[PDB]
RNA sequence: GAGGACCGAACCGACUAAUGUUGAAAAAUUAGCGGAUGACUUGUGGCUGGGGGUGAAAGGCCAAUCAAACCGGGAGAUAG
RNA sequence: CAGGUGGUCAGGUAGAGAAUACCAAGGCGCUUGAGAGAACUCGGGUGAAGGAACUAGGCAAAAUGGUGCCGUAACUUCGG
RNA sequence: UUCCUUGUCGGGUAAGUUCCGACCUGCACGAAUGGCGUAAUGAUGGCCAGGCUGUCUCCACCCGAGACUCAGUGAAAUUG
RNA sequence: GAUGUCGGCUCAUCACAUCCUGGGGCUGAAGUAGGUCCCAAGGGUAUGGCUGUUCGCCAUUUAAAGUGGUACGCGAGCUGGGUUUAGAACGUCGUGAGACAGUUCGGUCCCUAUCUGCCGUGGGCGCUGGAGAACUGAGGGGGGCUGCUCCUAGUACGAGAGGACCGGAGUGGACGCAUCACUGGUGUUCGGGUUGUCAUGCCAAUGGCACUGCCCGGUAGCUAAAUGCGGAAGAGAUAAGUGCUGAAAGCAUCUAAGCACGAAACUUGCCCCGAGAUGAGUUCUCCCUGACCCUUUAAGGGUCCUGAAGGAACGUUGAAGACGACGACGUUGAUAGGCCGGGUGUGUAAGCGCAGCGAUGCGUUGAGCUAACCGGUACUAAUGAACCGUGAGGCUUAACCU
């Protein structure tokens, strides 16, 4: 099975109307280090909910 | 359908899952904190925490039964000599899953899992 | 007659003293509280709106809370309407118990059947499986032909195909009422009713004989 | 749940004797033939027991007139009038389904001798 | 649970030993016959000097099945083999004069009272 | 201790089915299958050349090529 | 690139065996992963009662399977 | 090898255009382009029986590999 | 510069010239059972033996085993027996190469779906302030089969044999829906037995691998063979048909005026979907009551302040699920895991003691272990926030109030 006519650039754009990425709504701010992080994820320096959970 | 079924397949056969969680449980009690994917971490709870509950009653029967689940005497020794007494008063929930970033190689959701009493005094041994 | 909203507790059996096992479905029917009465003047049709169960105050929204406060009843886990037959009168805030079915012999139970997800034509429409051997190539559980040649040149609407199965409203009619336990809010009907354990059921007297 | 188990415990018999797979029991059931109701005995080996509270059951096997017969009883049914253990057998398993393939001397069961 | 091509033992003394169900009577597309159902049979094996001979086509009533019967209280009564009783092709009366092995009370009907009265044991 | 003897691995083969069929593969894989001391199989080297070779013979094979190979030439053959 | 490629070497336990299973010496995890646990396809496991009713056809599957001893028909070219 | 033809009769089956036995009316057998037999042999053709079974009545569940979602890479036939 | 060609399988759909069931007229219709014609398409409408077969014959059923259309429906769905290539053979024809709807044995069935269609399931925007619910029902779909026995009644009818209409009751087959209490299947996540081998130093005890190594049982879930329910009654308008009154036409006449009956068809009644029903409906509840500037001065633009109801996101998840969606829950917390207790399953662990030369047996012991189950329990993980969504909601007219 294969196309009988070349689909247009218009049809191609309509199909991709749902391919748009959804940016992260908002980052959480740690209460101790004040860093930004994904909610429910530890920070880049190992903080989570105001606690140094990993020492690296 | 999947109604009321439990346990993840993790894209492995049964014998591979059993071997993997046996190794992963041994690594968890040896280092007290490891980093793995979030699905593997959640299933590891149903493996390692029953071992800690088993290690609360020291006996040759429990030790052998724990050895059958881990196949490592160094692991069994630490379970009954360290982790047993350390969790003698805690009623379940010996682990803690902390979500972290995504693995660079495949964008897998990673997570730390650690024993709850891995405090600043663990550096003694 | 109006009906009641209950919860499917599960299935068990009742042994009759003459040695007959009756498979029953236990339906927990707590007090149904009338929250709104509709009439021909204001709404164009006669019906009552009832609620049942309880709900945590932190989970009810202000629009819903104001609706229950208007009636003066505690918030339940949902709202259901029942068309009133000619002669039935109810007041808002009035509570209706399971003993309404004291003399009812047969009921119709409505619920949401258990969801099977995406189901093939064999499971969903009882299609016949093609040959498992004798040369069959990758076509064991496929539906086979779905139409005729060029003359229709299309697939007719309503063709039986694979798709979502279950998880829909289903009514079982004319179920015998085995026992009405008013003091325990229980209603035992003979047979099986749609839905899983813990799902909401709507029990009405049998519209047929 | 608390609701259903409450409905079941008020229907269960309180005097069902204890028996194990391998014991030969004599079950007496109620046979209704119109205006009469007599007790018909059914003696054989217990080859399976299903413990489910009210839904408990057990299946008895006997060789009747050369034909092997198995009957599954609902232990809490009012049809089952009484249950009596004749002799206690000594088996290692919980389901004696292998007895279906044996007969005569091959289907013998050691007495528990307790 | 007897269907076509099923081999049954004979529970009477009419002379047949093995019969094969060739039709489940009493309804279009009817699939199975339980205890108490009439079936059309052919005789696959008979004794040398019985009342019937190999090849005859008769009717029979099923009296024992491995699938078993279900009682109103949920009990089951299973047997070790399937057995039937040969009936006259048009009169529906038993051909033999004796019945071997037990039967069930599903046969308790005026149509098969002759079989119930002759059975060594009714279950 | 005979055998174009028997059963059966290597080895040689290719009977059935499924898979694959823009393949992992321009002929395979998987499970079974035949022969397996012989008219056996295999390595290295050699010989036979195109109306010719070779063929336990299928018009089979002769470099993924065959009712007349391939390459160059006649050649821009001829084409109602 | 699941193909093809001659010769040499030949550990242990079980086994008739270079079959097969599990291992040694030694070498590898096959150059995308992570989840999910729909239909459907592929490769498998189990199956009530029935047992070829399937089908062009028992196709496929299931089944049989070893050693010792007992025993073994028609027919026969006297070997089977 | 027989068109008529599913010839006729017998056997097998509850039922047999196939099969086996016979008949002879050989459309259009026939004696080294061999006739008729024939033990053994056959991945040969047809037919029957036992065993066996998801082949089927009539499908059910389960274990794996895909399908599906996320990240990376990234084709093809076809196309006024 | 290709429209794959028989039959089967799967899946159908329409016609009515109706096979069954329903309603009738006539009968050389006593009854039963038929014959024939009219109306009627709602539903239903065999399994096997033989053959490639369609067909047909045969066996045995059934209320019946309808006739046709649909590319002799259906190969980008399956099959490949037949037909239809290359091999080979027979009969036959031909000197021969070869040939034969004559026969015989053998003989590669490709395609990842762009569009239409169809089955499902979402996103967007709309519906005129926003939001959360509950509905109305325009419209659409599903469903509609039937046997047998008993009573009426051995009555009506009939010489007898035989044997009813109408009406009522029970119980089946096929089909459909739902469910898992029971009976079972499965249950590579539970327990046990056991073969070979390797390992844990060794014994003992375990683990790995051998299809889950092979097996025996089996929880939850899923499920049929399991067990509940369904097809209706009723109503409206009718078909063929039967009529009442009744002229045209002193009579007669079912019809012309008028009136009454009349079928599984039609419209309802039953079940499901359903306000994108743009003709975008209704009801209830909830939320928002700040400034200021510019300009071409309007359904205008801008700044500051403000951010509600609610939503989404994220997390724990679900008998919900391909993904979205849908549901529950997020410390004022039982959402998941763990833990505790129970249940269930398996069947008397290990260790020790005793007996025995030993294999093993006995006692401790219905022991030990026990997945998805039940009841509990904040031990672990579900975070303070942030984000989206605003600030009283056009014009005209009419009835009401000011």
* Å separating the CA of residue C23 from the C1' of nucleotide I180: 11
Q: Tell me the C-alpha distance between D83 and D15, whole Å.
A: 10
Return the H-helix or E-strand segment holding E9: strand E7-10
From the Cβ of C157, is strand I under 7 Å away? Answer: yes
Would you give the end-to-end CA distance of chain A in angstroms? 55
Q: Tell me the C-alpha distance between E123 and E104, whole Å.
A: 4
> Which chain C residue is nearest to residue E71, measuring alpha carbons?
C20
With left for phi above 0 and alpha for psi between -120 and 50, is residue C65 left, alpha or beta?
alpha
* Å separating the CA of residue E94 from the C1' of nucleotide I159: 37
> What residues in D contact C28, CB-CB < 8 Å?
3
Backbone dihedral angles phi then psi of residue B39, each to the nearest 5 degrees: -65, -45
Q: Tell me the C-alpha distance between E68 and D70, whole Å.
A: 9
Closest CA to E47 of E80, E21, E12: E12
Domain of residue D7, residue span: 1-114
Which residues, 6+ apart, have CB-to-CB distance to B42 below 8 Å? B8, B97
Nucleotide nearest to D2 (CA to C1'): I375
Nucleotide nearest to C130 (CA to C1'): I10
By the 8 A CB rule, do C189 and C27 touch?
yes
Domain of residue B36, residue span: 13-115
| Total number of domains constituting chain A | 1
Chain D closest-CA separation from residue C26 CA (Å): 8
Q: Tell me the C-alpha distance between C166 and C194, whole Å.
A: 10
| DSSP state string for C1-55 | ---EEEEEEEEEEEEETTTEEEEEEEEE--PEEEEEEE-TTTTSS-EEEEE-S--
Q: Which two tokens stand for residue E36?
A: 């108490």
Beta carbons of C19 and D11 less than 8 Å apart: no
Edge-first strand listing for the sheet containing B33-37:
B33-37, B109-115, B95-102
Kindly give the pairing relationship between strand D57-64 and strand D67-74. Answer: antiparallel
- The partner residues of C111 in beta bridges, in order of sequence, read C170
| DSSP state string for D45-77 | EEEEEE--GGG-EEEEEEEETTEEEEEEEETTS
Q: Tell me the C-alpha distance between C167 and C114, whole Å.
A: 5
Closest CA to B98 of A49, A31, A35: A49
| Total number of domains constituting chain E | 1
Q: The CATH number of the domain where E79 resides is what?
A: 2.40.150.20
Report the protein residue whose CA lies nearest the C1' of nucleotide I366.
Answer: D20
User: Strand, coil or helix: what is C67?
Assistant: helix
Q: Tell me the C-alpha distance between E75 and D69, whole Å.
A: 13
- Neighbour subunits, A (≥3 Cβ pairs < 8 A): B
Experimental method: cryo-EM
Q: Tell me the C-alpha distance between E74 and D75, whole Å.
A: 11
Q: Which two tokens stand for residue C66?
A: 């104001």
Which residues, 6+ apart, have CB-to-CB distance to B68 below 8 Å? none
Q: Which positions in chain D have a beta carbon within 8 angstroms of at least one beta carbon in chain C?
A: 1, 3-4, 7-8, 11, 30, 32, 54-55, 74, 76-79
Q: Tell me the C-alpha distance between E121 and E98, whole Å.
A: 12
CB-CB: which of D66, D71, D100 is closest to E76? D71
Beta carbons within 10 angstroms of residue A52's beta carbon:
14
Instruction: Write the burial class of residue E93 (CB in 10 Å: 0-12 exposed, 13-18 middle, 19+ buried).
Output: exposed
Edge-first strand listing for the sheet containing C95-96:
C80-83, C47-51, C32-38, C95-96
CB-CB: which of C13, C15, C26 is closest to D3? C26
Q: Tell me the C-alpha distance between C9 and E120, whole Å.
A: 47
Kindly give the pairing relationship between strand C106-112 and strand C169-181. Answer: antiparallel
From the Cβ of E30, is strand H under 7 Å away? Answer: no
Backbone dihedral angles phi then psi of residue B60, each to the nearest 5 degrees: -65, -30
CA D12 remoteness from chain centre: 16
By the 8 A CB rule, do C13 and D77 touch?
no
Would you give the end-to-end CA distance of chain C in angstroms? 14
* Å separating the CA of residue C90 from the C1' of nucleotide I255: 56
Residue C124 DSSP label = H
Closest CA to C60 of C35, C93, C29: C35
- The partner residues of B15 in beta bridges, in order of sequence, read none
3-state SS record for chain B: CCCCCCCCCCCCCHHHHHHHHHHHHHHHHHHCEEEEEHHHHHHHHHHHHHHHHHCCCCCHHHHHHHHHHHCCHHHHHHHHHHHHHHCCCCCCCCEEEEEEEECCCCCCEEEEEEECCCCCCHHHC
Report the protein residue whose CA lies nearest the C1' of nucleotide I232.
Answer: C208
> Which chain C residue is nearest to residue B1, measuring alpha carbons?
C116
> What residues in E contact C20, CB-CB < 8 Å?
72-73
Count of residues making up chain E: 123
Which residues, 6+ apart, have CB-to-CB distance to C71 below 8 Å? C33, C34, C35, C36, C92, C93
Beta carbons within 10 angstroms of residue C181's beta carbon:
14
The angle subtended at Cα B84 by Cα B82 and Cα B85, nearest 5°, is 75
Q: Which two tokens stand for residue B60?
A: 């040759």
Identify from E104, E108, E123 which residue to disrupt to test chain D contact, counting D C-beta atoms within 10 A and taking the largest count: E123
Closest CA to D27 of D53, D54, D64, D62: D62
Q: Where are the domains positioned within chain C?
A: 1-209
Q: Tell me the C-alpha distance between C15 and C22, whole Å.
A: 6
Strand F near-CB residues (< 7 Å), C 120-179? 135, 137-138
The angle subtended at Cα E69 by Cα E19 and Cα E57, nearest 5°, is 20
Domain of residue E93, residue span: 1-123
From the Cβ of A22, is strand H under 7 Å away? Answer: no
Angle between helices B60-70 and B14-31 (to 10 degrees): 120
> What residues in B contact C116, CB-CB < 8 Å?
1
Q: Tell me the C-alpha distance between B103 and D20, whole Å.
A: 57
Chain B closest-CA separation from residue A49 CA (Å): 11
Residue B41, CA distances (Å) to A42, B91, B96, B125, D61 in order: 16, 20, 9, 25, 51
Instruction: Write the burial class of residue B20 (CB in 10 Å: 0-12 exposed, 13-18 middle, 19+ buried).
Output: middle
List the beta strands (DSSP E) in chain C. Answer: 4-16, 20-28, 32-38, 47-51, 80-83, 95-96, 106-112, 117-119, 163-165, 169-181, 186-190, 200-205
Closest CA to E7 of E15, E19, E17: E19
Using only C-alpha atoms, chain E has a radius of gyration, in whole angstroms, of: 13
Domain of residue A12, residue span: 1-56
Which residues, 6+ apart, have CB-to-CB distance to C122 below 8 Å? C129, C141
């Amino acid at each position: 099975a294969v196309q009988q006519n070349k689909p247009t650039r218009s049809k191609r754009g309509m199909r991709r109307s749902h391919d748009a990425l959804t940016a992260v709504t908002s980052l959480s701010v740690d209460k101790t280090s004040g860093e930004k992080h994904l909610r429910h994820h530890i920070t880049a320096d190992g903080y989570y909910r105001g606690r140094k959970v990993i020492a690296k | 359908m999947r109604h009321r079924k439990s346990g993840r397949q993790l894209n492995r056969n049964s014998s591979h899952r059993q071997a993997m969680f046996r190794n992963m449980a041994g690594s968890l009690v040896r280092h007290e904190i490891i980093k793995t994917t979030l699905p593997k971490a959640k299933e590891l709870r149903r493996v390692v925490e029953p071992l800690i509950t088993l290690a609360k009653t020291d006996s040759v029967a429990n030790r052998r039964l724990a050895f059958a689940r881990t196949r490592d005497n160094e692991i069994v020794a630490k379970l009954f000599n360290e982790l047993g007494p350390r969790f003698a008063s805690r009623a379940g929930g010996y682990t803690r899953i902390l979500k972290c970033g995504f693995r660079a190689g495949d964008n897998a959701p990673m997570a730390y899992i650690e024993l709850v009493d891995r405090s600043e005094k663990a550096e003694a041994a | 007659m109006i009906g009641l909203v209950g919860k499917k507790v599960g299935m068990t059996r009742i042994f009759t003293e003459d040695g007959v096992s009756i498979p029953v479905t236990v339906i927990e029917v707590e007090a149904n509280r009338v929250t709104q009465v509709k009439d021909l003047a204001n709404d164009g049709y006669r019906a009552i709106q009832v609620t049942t169960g309880a709900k945590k105050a932190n989970r009810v929204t202000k629009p819903e809370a104001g609706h229950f406060a208007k009636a003066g009843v505690e918030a339940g886990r949902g709202l259901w309407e029942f068309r009133l037959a000619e002669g039935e009168e109810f007041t808002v805030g009035q509570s209706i118990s399971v003993e309404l079915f004291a003399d009812v012999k047969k009921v119709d139970v409505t619920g949401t059947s258990k969801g099977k997800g995406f189901a093939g034509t064999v499971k969903r429409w009882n299609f016949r499986t093609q040959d498992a051997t004798h040369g069959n190539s990758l076509s064991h559980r496929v539906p086979g032909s779905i139409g005729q040649n060029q003359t229709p040149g299309k697939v007719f609407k309503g063709k039986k195909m694979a798709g979502q199965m279950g998880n829909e409203r289903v009514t079982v009619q004319s179920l015998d009422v085995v026992r009405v336990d008013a003091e325990r809010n229980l209603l035992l009907v003979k047979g099986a009713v749609p839905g899983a354990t813990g799902s909401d059921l709507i029990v009405k007297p049998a519209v047929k004989a | 749940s608390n609701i259903i188990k409450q409905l079941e415990q008020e229907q269960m018999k309180q005097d069902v004797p204890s028996f194990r797979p391998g014991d030969t029991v004599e079950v007496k059931v109620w046979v209704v033939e119109g205006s009469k109701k007599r007790l018909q005995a059914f003696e054989g080996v217990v080859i399976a027991i299903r413990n489910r509270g009210l839904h408990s059951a057990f299946t008895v096997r006997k060789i009747s007139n050369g034909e092997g017969v198995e009957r599954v009883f609902q232990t809490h049914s009012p049809v089952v009038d009484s249950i009596s253990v004749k002799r206690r057998g000594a088996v290692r398993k919980a389901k004696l389904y292998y007895l279906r393939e044996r007969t005569g001397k091959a289907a013998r069961i050691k007495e528990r001798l307790n | 649970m007897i269907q076509e091509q099923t081999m049954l033992n004979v529970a009477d003394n009419s002379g047949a030993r093995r019969v094969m169900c060739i039709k489940v009577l009493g309804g279009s597309h009817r699939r199975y016959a339980g205890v108490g159902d009439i079936i059309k049979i052919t005789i696959k094996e008979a004794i040398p000097r019985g009342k019937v001979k190999k090849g005859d086509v008769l009717k029979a009533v099923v009296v024992r099945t491995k699938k078993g019967v279900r009682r109103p209280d949920g009990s089951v009564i299973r047997f070790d083999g399937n057995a039937c009783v040969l009936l006259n092709n048009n009169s529906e009366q038993p051909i033999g004069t004796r019945i071997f092995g037990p039967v069930t009370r599903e046969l308790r009907s005026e149509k098969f009272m002759k079989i119930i009265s002759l059975a060594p044991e009714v279950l």
